[PDB]
Amino acid sequence: RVKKLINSQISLLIGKGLHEFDSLRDPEVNDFRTKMRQFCEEAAAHRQQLGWVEWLQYSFPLQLEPRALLVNVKFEGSEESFTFQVSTKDMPLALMACALRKKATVFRQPQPEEYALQVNGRHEYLYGNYPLCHFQYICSCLHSGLTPHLTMVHSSSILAMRDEQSNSLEQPFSIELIRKVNADERMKVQAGLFHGNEMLCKTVSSCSEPVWKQRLEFDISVCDLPRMARLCFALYAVADCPIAWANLMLFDYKDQLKTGERCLYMWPSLLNPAGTVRGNPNTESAAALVIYLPEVAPVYFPALEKILELGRHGELREILERLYEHEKDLVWKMRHEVQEHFPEALARLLLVTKWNKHEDVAQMLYLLCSWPELPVLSALELLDFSFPDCYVGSFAIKSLRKLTDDELFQYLLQLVQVLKYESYLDCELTKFLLGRALANRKIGHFLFWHLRSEMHVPSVALRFGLIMEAYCRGSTHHMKVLMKQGEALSKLKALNDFVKVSSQKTTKPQTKEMMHMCMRQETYMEALSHLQSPLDPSTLLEEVCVEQCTFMDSKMKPLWIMYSSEEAGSAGNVGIIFKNGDDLRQDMLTLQMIQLMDVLWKQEGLDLRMTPYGCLPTGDRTGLIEVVLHSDTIANIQLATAAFNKDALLNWLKSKNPGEALDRAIEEFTLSCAGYCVATYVLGIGDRHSDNIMIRESGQLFHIDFGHFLGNFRVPFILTYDFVHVIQQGKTNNSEKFERFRGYCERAYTILRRHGLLFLHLFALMRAAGLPELSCSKDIQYLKDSLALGKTEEEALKHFRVKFNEALRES
Ligand SMILES: Nc1cc(C(F)(F)F)c(-c2cc(N3CCOCC3)nc(N3CCOCC3)n2)cn1
C-alpha cells in the first residue's frame, strides 16, 4: 500500500500516469525503467549513510562568489542572540568558536567543528574553509549595508534531517515502401540516410491511403552502415507542399539490425535528420507510412573488441587547425599526429572521417579509445548533433565528469536540450544527469523543472517522463517537496484564470479584492504557503501576504505574489510573478547568458553589478519570474520635482540615496549600465525602451522581458541620453565620468570575446530547443559577428569603438 501511494504520487508529480508506460508494451521503455530505478536506488542508499557535512554538501550546496562586519548569531532552539564584530577574512569556524564562547559565558557553564551556520529563514548554510566574504550571502550583505543573521545548527540536528528524509554483407542497403494522408487530390515520398547532419549517400525518392510497393535502394552497402545510422522520410505533394516527416534508427537499442515490418506514425510539417526517432503518439489522426526492412541474413553491430582489432592496423596540418577538399585528406592522413600532438583538434578530425565507410570508422574509433581527456569547452562541442556516434558521445561525457557542480548548474539547460538529439532511451547522458542530480539536490531540483516544463510536448513526454520517474525512485523525500511546489502552481493557474475572467468584467480594485478572497480560502492558504521556491530551492516561501498580492495589466494578467517569514527577517520578504499564456524559455536562456557574462566578468575582477533574476518555465506556457524588490521602471520614474524631464532619474536616485550615498548609487548605475549595454549588444536584444528597463534603489539598472534576441524583430549599440545624463552626474560635459564608462563597456566586451567559443558551443546545443529565434546558422552567425572572433583583439576593439561612437552621436 505504501508502493501504491508512491506510484500515484509520481503520476501526479510528473504529469503522466505510470500505467501509460506499461500499456506501450515496449521492451526499450521496460528496460530503461528497471535499470534506471536500481541505479537511482543505489544512489539513495549511498546518500543515507553520508557524513553530516557530506549530507549538507548534497542538500545545501555552498553558494560562493565566482574589512570588518557585525554578525548576529543565535542558536537553534533559542530566542536569545548575540552580535559580534568579526572580519570579512575570518573563516566560519572562527565565528562558531566566538559564538560558543558567548553562550558558555552567558550560561555560566564551561567544539565548533560539530556545527554549521544556517542563514536565518533560508535553506542556505555557511561551512568549509572559506573566508566570510567569499560566501554569496555575506558578500551580498556587505554591498547592501545589511547585517548577516546566522543560526548555529548542531551535527545531531543535521543528522536528524538526513534520517527524516530516508526512503559483413556487401548487399546494397534497401527498404520496401509498402494511411491517413491529407493533401490536394489534384496533386500526387523522399527518403535519405543520415549520420547526424551528414548524408551517408544521395537522397532516394519514390490521394489518401497510398499504395507504393516500390523497392528503395541506397548507394551504400549494408556493411558500411554506422551504428548510429538514421533513415529519414518526408511525405510531400507535387511549388512544394510539405505534409509529414518520420525518422528511425537502422539498429535498435540492443545493437541488432532492424529486419522486419514497421508502421511509421508521422509528425506533421524537407528531410528532418535532427528530429526525434520515435513515432507520433497521436496514432488516431497522424499520417502513417508502411515500411519493410528485408532480412539481410541475426546481425548485431560488431563489439568493441572486433572494432579495435580492425582499426588497429594502419600507419601543413598546423595551419589547417585554427576546410577545402584537399585539406580534409591531410587531416585524415596525419590522424595519429593529430592524437599525439593536437588532442584538442579531435572534433576537426571527426568531421573529416568518412562515416559511410566502415574501415574508416574502426580506425577513428581505435584512436578515440586511447584519446586523452579534453577540457570541458572541447567536450561541450562534442555534444552537438554533428557528433552522433555512441563512442564519441560516451568520450564527451567522460570529459564532462570533471565539471564542478557550479559549472554543471550553469550548463544544465543545454545538457537537458541535448537529450532531444538522443537516439535511444538508456544513454550515458541520462545516466550522468541522473547521478549528478541524485548527488546534489539543487541540480535535482532544476533537472526536474526543466523536464516537467516540457511534458505537454509529445516528442519528449515519454523520455522526460521516464527520467523524472527514475529520479523520484532515488529521492522519495524530494518528490514530496516538489509535489508541494506543483500544488502551489496548480492553485496559481486556477487563481490566474479567475483574474483573467474577472478583469474583463469589472474594475481593477474589484478584481484584486476578489483575488484576495479566493486566496483567503483554506485550500489556497494551505497550497500557497510553506514551500521551497521553484526559482531557488534555498529561498523558503513561508506566509503568503495576501494584502500585498496583485496582478499586472498586460494581456495575460500576470500575478504578483508576495511572501513573508518572521524567522528570515527582512530577507524573508520575497516576491514571485506567475505568468500563464506566454512562453518563458527564451527569457530563461537570455537571463542565464547574462548570468554567465556576470561570472566571466567577475573571474577577471570586473563586477558590473548585474541583476540576473530567476526565470523558470514550469509547464505549458507557464512559469515563474523572481521579483527584485525596491525597483521601478524608467517610465514610472519619469512620470523631488524636476524642472526638466532629464533630471527625473537623477532626482529619484537622490531621494533614495541622500548625502554621501549618491556617489555610490551613480557608480552602481554606471557599472550595470555598461554591463547591460554590452549584453544587449552582444546578444542582439532590440526593442529596449523605458517600460522594459528598471532601476533598483541602490542605483543598479537592469533589463526585463527579453522578447527578441539575435537581431530578430543587426541591432546597434545603444547609448540612451537619460542614462548618459546620470553617468555624467547631471552635467552637460563630463568626459572624466563618461570615458570611465566607455572603459567599462570595452573591458566587458573584450572579456566576453575571450570566452566566445563557450557562448557559440552553448548556443549550438540550444538549437535543440526549437526556439523560433534560435533555429538556424544565421542566428549563430549573429553571435560570431557581434563577438568578431575572426578578428584580432585590436581590430575587434576598433570596430566596437566605431559602434560605440556611432551610438554616442545617435544619443
Ligand atoms: N517575459 C517577461 C514578462 C514579465 C511580466 F511579468 F510582465 F509578465 C516580466 C516582468 C515584468 C515586470 N513588470 C513590472 C513593471 O511593469 C511592467 C511589468 N516586472 C518584472 N520584474 C521581474 C524582476 O524584478 C522586478 C519585477 N518582470 C519579465 N519578463
Short mmCIF file of C-alpha atoms in Angstrom, two decimals, residues 147-595:
data_model
loop_
_atom_site.label_atom_id
_atom_site.label_comp_id
_atom_site.label_asym_id
_atom_site.label_seq_id
_atom_site.Cartn_x
_atom_site.Cartn_y
_atom_site.Cartn_z
CA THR A 147 23.83 42.69 8.88
CA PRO A 148 24.24 38.91 8.40
CA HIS A 149 21.87 36.78 10.52
CA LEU A 150 23.08 33.21 11.25
CA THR A 151 21.96 30.21 13.33
CA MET A 152 24.31 27.67 14.89
CA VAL A 153 22.97 24.28 13.81
CA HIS A 154 24.48 21.19 15.59
CA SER A 155 25.60 17.96 13.82
CA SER A 156 22.87 15.89 15.57
CA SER A 157 20.22 18.27 14.18
CA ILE A 158 21.65 17.95 10.60
CA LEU A 159 21.73 14.11 11.05
CA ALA A 160 18.06 14.25 12.13
CA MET A 161 17.24 15.86 8.73
CA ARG A 162 19.15 13.09 6.88
CA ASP A 163 17.23 10.43 8.83
CA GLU A 164 13.81 12.12 8.31
CA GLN A 165 14.42 12.22 4.51
CA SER A 166 15.07 8.44 4.13
CA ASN A 167 13.18 6.15 1.64
CA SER A 168 29.87 -8.18 -43.31
CA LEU A 169 27.15 -8.13 -46.13
CA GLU A 170 28.16 -6.35 -49.39
CA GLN A 171 24.39 -6.32 -50.35
CA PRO A 172 23.37 -2.68 -51.01
CA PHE A 173 21.08 -1.11 -48.36
CA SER A 174 17.38 -1.30 -49.29
CA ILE A 175 13.85 -0.84 -47.89
CA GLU A 176 10.31 -1.56 -49.13
CA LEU A 177 7.90 1.40 -49.26
CA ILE A 178 4.83 -0.83 -48.59
CA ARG A 179 -2.59 5.61 -44.40
CA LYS A 180 -4.22 8.94 -43.42
CA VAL A 181 -2.69 11.47 -45.86
CA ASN A 182 -4.48 14.86 -46.03
CA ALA A 183 -3.47 16.72 -49.21
CA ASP A 184 -4.89 18.21 -52.51
CA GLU A 185 -6.40 15.32 -54.53
CA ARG A 186 -5.40 17.12 -57.77
CA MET A 187 -1.66 16.60 -56.83
CA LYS A 188 0.37 13.34 -56.25
CA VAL A 189 7.92 10.42 -50.64
CA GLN A 190 11.64 11.39 -50.24
CA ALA A 191 13.99 9.14 -48.24
CA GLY A 192 17.58 9.74 -47.08
CA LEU A 193 20.27 8.10 -44.94
CA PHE A 194 21.95 10.27 -42.30
CA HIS A 195 24.65 10.02 -39.65
CA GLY A 196 23.75 13.20 -37.79
CA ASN A 197 23.83 16.14 -40.21
CA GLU A 198 25.87 14.37 -42.92
CA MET A 199 24.26 12.34 -45.71
CA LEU A 200 25.55 8.73 -45.87
CA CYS A 201 24.51 8.60 -49.62
CA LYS A 202 22.39 10.55 -52.19
CA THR A 203 18.66 11.08 -51.45
CA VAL A 204 16.34 8.39 -52.91
CA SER A 205 12.76 9.36 -53.91
CA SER A 206 9.56 7.43 -54.74
CA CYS A 207 -4.66 10.85 -52.93
CA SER A 208 -5.31 9.35 -49.40
CA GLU A 209 -4.19 5.86 -48.18
CA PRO A 210 -1.46 5.46 -50.82
CA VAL A 211 0.00 2.18 -52.05
CA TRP A 212 3.56 2.28 -53.38
CA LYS A 213 5.05 -1.28 -53.24
CA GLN A 214 8.39 0.17 -54.51
CA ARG A 215 11.96 -1.03 -53.85
CA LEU A 216 14.04 1.85 -52.44
CA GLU A 217 17.79 1.09 -52.75
CA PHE A 218 20.61 3.30 -51.35
CA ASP A 219 24.09 3.81 -52.85
CA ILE A 220 25.84 2.31 -49.77
CA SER A 221 26.33 -1.38 -48.79
CA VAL A 222 24.78 -2.86 -45.59
CA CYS A 223 28.30 -3.36 -44.13
CA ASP A 224 29.05 0.42 -44.35
CA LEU A 225 26.12 1.44 -42.11
CA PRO A 226 27.43 3.17 -38.97
CA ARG A 227 25.97 2.10 -35.60
CA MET A 228 24.00 5.38 -35.44
CA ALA A 229 22.57 5.33 -39.00
CA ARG A 230 19.20 7.17 -39.39
CA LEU A 231 16.62 6.52 -42.16
CA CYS A 232 14.75 9.83 -42.69
CA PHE A 233 11.42 10.12 -44.56
CA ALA A 234 9.46 13.07 -45.96
CA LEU A 235 5.89 12.75 -47.30
CA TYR A 236 5.09 15.76 -49.51
CA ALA A 237 2.96 16.68 -52.61
CA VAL A 238 3.89 17.70 -56.19
CA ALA A 239 5.61 24.82 -55.66
CA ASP A 240 6.26 22.13 -52.98
CA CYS A 241 3.63 21.38 -50.30
CA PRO A 242 5.06 19.53 -47.26
CA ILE A 243 2.75 17.17 -45.35
CA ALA A 244 4.69 15.00 -42.83
CA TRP A 245 8.13 13.54 -41.77
CA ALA A 246 9.40 10.44 -39.84
CA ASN A 247 12.84 9.12 -38.75
CA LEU A 248 14.10 5.79 -37.39
CA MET A 249 17.38 4.15 -36.35
CA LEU A 250 18.52 1.20 -38.51
CA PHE A 251 19.81 -0.67 -35.43
CA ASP A 252 17.64 -0.97 -32.28
CA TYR A 253 18.72 -0.33 -28.63
CA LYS A 254 20.08 -3.93 -28.43
CA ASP A 255 22.65 -3.32 -31.26
CA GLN A 256 20.69 -5.60 -33.65
CA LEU A 257 19.96 -4.56 -37.23
CA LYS A 258 16.22 -3.97 -37.77
CA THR A 259 14.90 -6.62 -40.15
CA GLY A 260 11.09 -6.65 -40.22
CA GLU A 261 7.81 -4.74 -40.87
CA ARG A 262 7.36 -1.22 -39.47
CA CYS A 263 4.50 1.31 -39.26
CA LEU A 264 5.67 4.94 -39.08
CA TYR A 265 3.38 7.40 -37.29
CA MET A 266 4.42 10.69 -38.87
CA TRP A 267 4.85 14.20 -37.41
CA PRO A 268 3.17 16.98 -39.45
CA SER A 269 5.12 19.74 -41.28
CA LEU A 270 12.01 18.81 -46.22
CA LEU A 271 14.00 15.88 -44.72
CA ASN A 272 14.49 16.46 -40.97
CA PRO A 273 17.50 14.46 -39.60
CA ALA A 274 17.65 16.25 -36.22
CA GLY A 275 14.00 15.32 -35.49
CA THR A 276 13.16 12.55 -32.98
CA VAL A 277 13.48 8.86 -33.96
CA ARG A 278 10.20 7.90 -32.19
CA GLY A 279 6.78 7.79 -33.84
CA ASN A 280 3.96 10.30 -33.32
CA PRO A 281 1.88 9.26 -30.24
CA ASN A 282 -1.34 10.55 -31.82
CA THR A 283 -1.82 7.30 -33.83
CA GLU A 284 -5.51 8.15 -34.45
CA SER A 285 -5.03 11.30 -36.58
CA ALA A 286 -1.37 11.18 -37.79
CA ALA A 287 -0.44 10.10 -41.33
CA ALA A 288 1.34 6.71 -41.41
CA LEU A 289 3.90 5.08 -43.73
CA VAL A 290 4.19 1.31 -44.09
CA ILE A 291 7.80 0.11 -44.42
CA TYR A 292 9.59 -3.29 -44.58
CA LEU A 293 13.23 -3.91 -43.63
CA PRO A 294 14.39 -7.04 -45.55
CA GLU A 295 16.18 -9.88 -43.72
CA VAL A 296 19.83 -9.44 -44.80
CA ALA A 297 20.84 -12.84 -43.27
CA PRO A 298 20.73 -12.31 -36.81
CA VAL A 299 23.13 -9.42 -37.37
CA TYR A 300 24.41 -7.31 -34.43
CA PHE A 301 26.82 -4.35 -34.57
CA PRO A 302 30.41 -5.62 -34.09
CA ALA A 303 31.57 -5.39 -30.45
CA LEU A 304 34.41 -3.05 -29.30
CA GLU A 305 36.96 -5.93 -29.37
CA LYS A 306 36.24 -6.70 -33.07
CA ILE A 307 36.29 -2.94 -33.93
CA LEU A 308 39.63 -2.27 -32.12
CA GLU A 309 41.10 -5.31 -33.91
CA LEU A 310 40.17 -3.90 -37.36
CA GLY A 311 41.12 -0.28 -36.55
CA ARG A 312 44.48 -1.32 -35.00
CA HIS A 313 46.10 -1.73 -38.42
CA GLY A 314 47.28 1.33 -40.36
CA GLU A 315 50.24 3.77 -40.43
CA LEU A 316 50.89 21.94 -43.09
CA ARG A 317 48.41 20.45 -40.56
CA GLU A 318 49.24 23.20 -38.00
CA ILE A 319 47.99 25.90 -40.44
CA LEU A 320 44.77 23.88 -41.04
CA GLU A 321 43.93 23.68 -37.30
CA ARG A 322 42.88 27.23 -36.35
CA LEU A 323 38.28 23.09 -44.77
CA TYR A 324 38.93 22.53 -48.50
CA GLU A 325 38.61 19.08 -50.19
CA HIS A 326 42.43 18.53 -50.23
CA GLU A 327 42.74 19.87 -46.64
CA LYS A 328 40.45 17.04 -45.42
CA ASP A 329 42.81 14.40 -46.93
CA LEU A 330 45.84 15.77 -44.99
CA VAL A 331 43.91 15.87 -41.66
CA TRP A 332 42.87 12.19 -42.11
CA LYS A 333 46.36 11.10 -43.24
CA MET A 334 48.02 12.62 -40.17
CA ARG A 335 45.28 11.42 -37.74
CA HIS A 336 47.89 9.82 -35.39
CA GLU A 337 49.91 13.09 -35.31
CA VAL A 338 46.55 14.82 -34.51
CA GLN A 339 46.03 12.49 -31.49
CA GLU A 340 49.64 12.71 -30.21
CA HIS A 341 50.28 16.45 -30.82
CA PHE A 342 46.83 18.13 -31.17
CA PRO A 343 44.35 16.21 -28.94
CA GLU A 344 42.03 19.25 -28.71
CA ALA A 345 41.52 19.14 -32.53
CA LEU A 346 39.51 15.84 -32.14
CA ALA A 347 36.26 17.41 -33.48
CA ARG A 348 38.00 18.59 -36.69
CA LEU A 349 39.23 15.01 -37.34
CA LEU A 350 35.78 13.52 -36.57
CA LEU A 351 34.20 15.90 -39.17
CA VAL A 352 36.52 14.67 -41.98
CA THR A 353 36.10 10.91 -41.15
CA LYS A 354 34.21 9.06 -43.89
CA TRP A 355 31.31 7.86 -41.72
CA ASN A 356 29.89 5.93 -44.74
CA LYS A 357 33.00 3.62 -44.84
CA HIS A 358 33.22 1.03 -42.04
CA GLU A 359 37.00 0.67 -42.42
CA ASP A 360 37.47 4.43 -41.77
CA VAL A 361 35.19 4.39 -38.69
CA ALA A 362 37.05 1.48 -36.99
CA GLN A 363 40.39 3.32 -37.38
CA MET A 364 38.85 6.57 -35.99
CA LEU A 365 37.42 4.57 -33.03
CA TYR A 366 40.84 2.91 -32.49
CA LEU A 367 42.43 6.37 -31.93
CA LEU A 368 39.38 7.60 -29.97
CA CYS A 369 39.56 4.67 -27.49
CA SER A 370 43.06 5.84 -26.43
CA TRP A 371 42.48 9.65 -26.86
CA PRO A 372 43.31 11.70 -23.75
CA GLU A 373 40.54 13.58 -21.93
CA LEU A 374 39.68 17.03 -23.29
CA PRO A 375 38.78 20.24 -21.45
CA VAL A 376 35.09 20.91 -20.72
CA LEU A 377 34.95 23.54 -23.53
CA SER A 378 36.05 20.89 -26.08
CA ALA A 379 33.62 18.30 -24.55
CA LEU A 380 30.63 20.72 -24.92
CA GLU A 381 31.37 20.98 -28.66
CA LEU A 382 31.39 17.15 -28.95
CA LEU A 383 27.82 17.01 -27.57
CA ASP A 384 26.45 18.67 -30.75
CA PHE A 385 24.19 16.81 -33.24
CA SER A 386 27.23 16.92 -35.63
CA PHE A 387 28.72 14.08 -33.49
CA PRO A 388 26.08 11.32 -33.30
CA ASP A 389 28.38 8.32 -32.69
CA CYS A 390 27.84 6.45 -29.38
CA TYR A 391 31.57 6.16 -28.60
CA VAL A 392 32.21 9.84 -29.42
CA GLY A 393 29.26 10.77 -27.14
CA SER A 394 30.50 8.50 -24.31
CA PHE A 395 34.00 10.10 -24.64
CA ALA A 396 32.36 13.57 -24.42
CA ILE A 397 30.52 12.59 -21.19
CA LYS A 398 33.79 11.10 -19.80
CA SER A 399 35.46 14.51 -20.40
CA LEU A 400 32.43 16.25 -18.76
CA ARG A 401 32.76 14.26 -15.49
CA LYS A 402 35.33 16.81 -14.21
CA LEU A 403 32.63 19.57 -14.31
CA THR A 404 32.12 21.13 -10.90
CA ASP A 405 28.50 21.24 -9.60
CA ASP A 406 28.57 25.03 -10.19
CA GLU A 407 29.66 24.64 -13.86
CA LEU A 408 27.15 21.78 -14.31
CA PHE A 409 24.40 24.05 -12.98
CA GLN A 410 25.48 26.86 -15.38
CA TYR A 411 25.23 24.50 -18.44
CA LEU A 412 22.30 22.30 -17.21
CA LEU A 413 19.68 23.87 -19.53
CA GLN A 414 21.81 22.96 -22.61
CA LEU A 415 22.52 19.39 -21.38
CA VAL A 416 18.76 18.82 -20.98
CA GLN A 417 18.06 20.08 -24.55
CA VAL A 418 20.76 17.71 -25.89
CA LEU A 419 18.53 14.78 -24.65
CA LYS A 420 16.22 15.59 -27.65
CA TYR A 421 19.05 14.56 -30.06
CA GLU A 422 19.45 11.11 -28.35
CA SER A 423 18.58 8.07 -30.41
CA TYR A 424 17.89 5.68 -27.50
CA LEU A 425 16.25 5.96 -24.04
CA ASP A 426 19.11 4.45 -21.94
CA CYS A 427 22.09 6.69 -22.69
CA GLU A 428 25.26 7.85 -20.88
CA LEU A 429 23.96 11.47 -20.83
CA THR A 430 20.76 10.41 -18.97
CA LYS A 431 22.83 8.31 -16.53
CA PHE A 432 25.25 11.19 -15.96
CA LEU A 433 22.47 13.79 -15.43
CA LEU A 434 20.59 11.41 -13.07
CA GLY A 435 23.70 10.54 -11.00
CA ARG A 436 24.70 14.21 -10.74
CA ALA A 437 21.08 15.17 -9.77
CA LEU A 438 20.99 12.46 -7.09
CA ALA A 439 24.32 13.66 -5.59
CA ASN A 440 23.20 17.39 -5.47
CA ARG A 441 19.63 18.44 -4.50
CA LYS A 442 19.92 21.82 -6.32
CA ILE A 443 20.85 20.03 -9.60
CA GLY A 444 18.00 17.56 -8.92
CA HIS A 445 15.56 20.44 -8.40
CA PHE A 446 16.36 22.27 -11.74
CA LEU A 447 16.68 18.97 -13.69
CA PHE A 448 13.16 18.11 -12.50
CA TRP A 449 11.69 21.50 -13.57
CA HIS A 450 13.43 21.52 -16.96
CA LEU A 451 11.90 18.06 -17.70
CA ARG A 452 8.47 18.83 -16.13
CA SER A 453 8.06 22.09 -18.05
CA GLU A 454 8.06 20.10 -21.35
CA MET A 455 5.57 17.28 -20.57
CA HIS A 456 2.99 18.94 -22.89
CA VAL A 457 5.46 18.40 -25.86
CA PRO A 458 4.63 14.94 -27.40
CA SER A 459 8.12 14.33 -28.86
CA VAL A 460 9.74 14.45 -25.38
CA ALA A 461 6.94 13.47 -22.94
CA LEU A 462 7.85 9.75 -22.82
CA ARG A 463 11.63 10.35 -22.45
CA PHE A 464 11.27 13.21 -19.91
CA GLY A 465 8.54 11.32 -18.04
CA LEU A 466 10.74 8.22 -17.63
CA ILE A 467 13.76 10.25 -16.33
CA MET A 468 11.59 12.11 -13.71
CA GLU A 469 10.16 8.70 -12.58
CA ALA A 470 13.71 7.20 -12.14
CA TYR A 471 14.74 10.39 -10.24
CA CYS A 472 11.71 10.04 -7.94
CA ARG A 473 12.83 6.44 -7.07
CA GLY A 474 16.19 7.90 -5.94
CA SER A 475 14.53 10.53 -3.65
CA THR A 476 11.13 9.91 -2.04
CA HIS A 477 11.54 12.96 0.22
CA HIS A 478 12.38 15.35 -2.64
CA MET A 479 9.36 14.04 -4.61
CA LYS A 480 7.16 15.27 -1.71
CA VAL A 481 8.93 18.68 -1.72
CA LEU A 482 8.41 19.05 -5.50
CA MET A 483 4.71 17.94 -5.07
CA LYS A 484 4.18 20.81 -2.63
CA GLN A 485 5.58 23.15 -5.41
CA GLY A 486 3.29 21.63 -8.09
CA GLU A 487 0.25 22.05 -5.83
CA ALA A 488 1.08 25.79 -5.43
CA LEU A 489 1.43 26.21 -9.24
CA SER A 490 -1.84 24.38 -9.80
CA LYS A 491 -3.61 26.87 -7.48
CA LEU A 492 -1.84 29.88 -9.15
CA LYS A 493 -3.15 28.62 -12.53
CA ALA A 494 -6.76 28.47 -11.15
CA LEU A 495 -6.33 31.90 -9.46
CA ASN A 496 -4.86 33.46 -12.68
CA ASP A 497 -7.80 32.07 -14.74
CA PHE A 498 -10.23 33.75 -12.31
CA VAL A 499 -8.26 37.04 -12.61
CA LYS A 500 -8.31 36.90 -16.45
CA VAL A 501 -12.11 36.39 -16.48
CA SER A 502 -12.85 38.95 -13.74
CA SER A 503 -10.63 41.71 -15.24
CA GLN A 504 -12.77 41.71 -18.43
CA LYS A 505 -16.00 42.24 -16.42
CA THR A 506 -15.11 44.68 -13.58
CA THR A 507 -12.64 47.36 -12.29
CA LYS A 508 -9.07 46.61 -11.11
CA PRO A 509 -9.80 47.31 -7.37
CA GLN A 510 -12.78 44.94 -7.57
CA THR A 511 -10.84 42.09 -9.28
CA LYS A 512 -7.95 42.49 -6.80
CA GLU A 513 -10.31 42.24 -3.77
CA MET A 514 -11.94 39.10 -5.25
CA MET A 515 -8.47 37.61 -5.91
CA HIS A 516 -7.71 38.13 -2.18
CA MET A 517 -10.99 36.41 -1.12
CA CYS A 518 -10.11 33.48 -3.38
CA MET A 519 -6.57 33.37 -1.79
CA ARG A 520 -8.01 33.59 1.74
CA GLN A 521 -9.88 30.28 1.22
CA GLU A 522 -8.29 27.43 3.31
CA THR A 523 -7.34 25.31 0.26
CA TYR A 524 -5.46 28.32 -1.21
CA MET A 525 -3.73 29.50 2.05
CA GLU A 526 -2.54 25.86 2.53
CA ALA A 527 -1.39 25.17 -1.07
CA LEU A 528 0.34 28.57 -1.47
CA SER A 529 2.23 28.61 1.86
CA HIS A 530 5.30 26.83 3.29
CA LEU A 531 7.11 25.75 0.17
CA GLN A 532 10.60 25.96 -1.40
CA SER A 533 10.67 28.35 -4.31
CA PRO A 534 10.83 26.64 -7.76
CA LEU A 535 13.02 29.65 -8.81
CA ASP A 536 15.53 28.89 -5.97
CA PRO A 537 15.16 25.94 -3.57
CA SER A 538 17.26 27.74 -0.91
CA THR A 539 14.60 30.54 -0.72
CA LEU A 540 11.68 29.50 1.53
CA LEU A 541 8.20 30.88 0.63
CA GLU A 542 6.57 30.91 4.09
CA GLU A 543 3.40 33.01 4.64
CA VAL A 544 1.72 34.39 1.54
CA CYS A 545 0.94 38.14 2.23
CA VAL A 546 -2.45 38.29 0.53
CA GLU A 547 -2.85 42.08 1.08
CA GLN A 548 0.34 42.67 -0.95
CA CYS A 549 -0.70 40.28 -3.79
CA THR A 550 -2.00 41.74 -7.07
CA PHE A 551 -1.91 41.29 -10.87
CA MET A 552 -0.40 43.28 -13.72
CA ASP A 553 -2.38 44.91 -16.57
CA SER A 554 -0.79 43.20 -19.61
CA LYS A 555 -2.76 40.68 -21.77
CA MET A 556 -2.16 37.57 -19.62
CA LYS A 557 -2.76 39.36 -16.24
CA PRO A 558 0.43 38.04 -14.59
CA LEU A 559 0.10 37.53 -10.79
CA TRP A 560 2.40 39.31 -8.35
CA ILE A 561 2.65 37.18 -5.21
CA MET A 562 4.32 38.35 -2.00
CA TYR A 563 5.58 36.28 0.88
CA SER A 564 6.99 36.93 4.33
CA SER A 565 8.81 34.95 7.07
CA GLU A 566 9.43 36.09 10.70
CA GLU A 567 12.42 33.65 11.04
CA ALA A 568 14.18 35.14 7.99
CA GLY A 569 13.55 38.80 8.99
CA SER A 570 13.54 41.45 6.21
CA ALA A 571 15.23 38.87 3.88
CA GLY A 572 12.16 36.56 4.09
CA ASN A 573 10.14 39.24 2.19
CA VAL A 574 10.27 37.81 -1.29
CA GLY A 575 8.07 38.02 -4.33
CA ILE A 576 7.27 35.84 -7.35
CA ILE A 577 5.50 36.55 -10.64
CA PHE A 578 3.34 33.79 -12.07
CA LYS A 579 2.68 34.07 -15.82
CA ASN A 580 0.39 31.85 -17.86
CA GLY A 581 -0.18 32.19 -21.63
CA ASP A 582 3.29 33.09 -22.88
CA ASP A 583 6.47 31.03 -23.27
CA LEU A 584 9.34 31.90 -20.81
CA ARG A 585 12.08 29.66 -22.42
CA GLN A 586 13.80 32.45 -24.37
CA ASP A 587 13.76 34.77 -21.29
CA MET A 588 15.35 31.98 -19.22
CA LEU A 589 18.06 31.44 -21.87
CA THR A 590 18.77 35.20 -22.11
CA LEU A 591 18.96 35.60 -18.34
CA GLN A 592 21.27 32.55 -17.96
CA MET A 593 23.60 34.04 -20.67
CA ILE A 594 23.68 37.42 -18.81
CA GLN A 595 24.43 35.46 -15.58
#
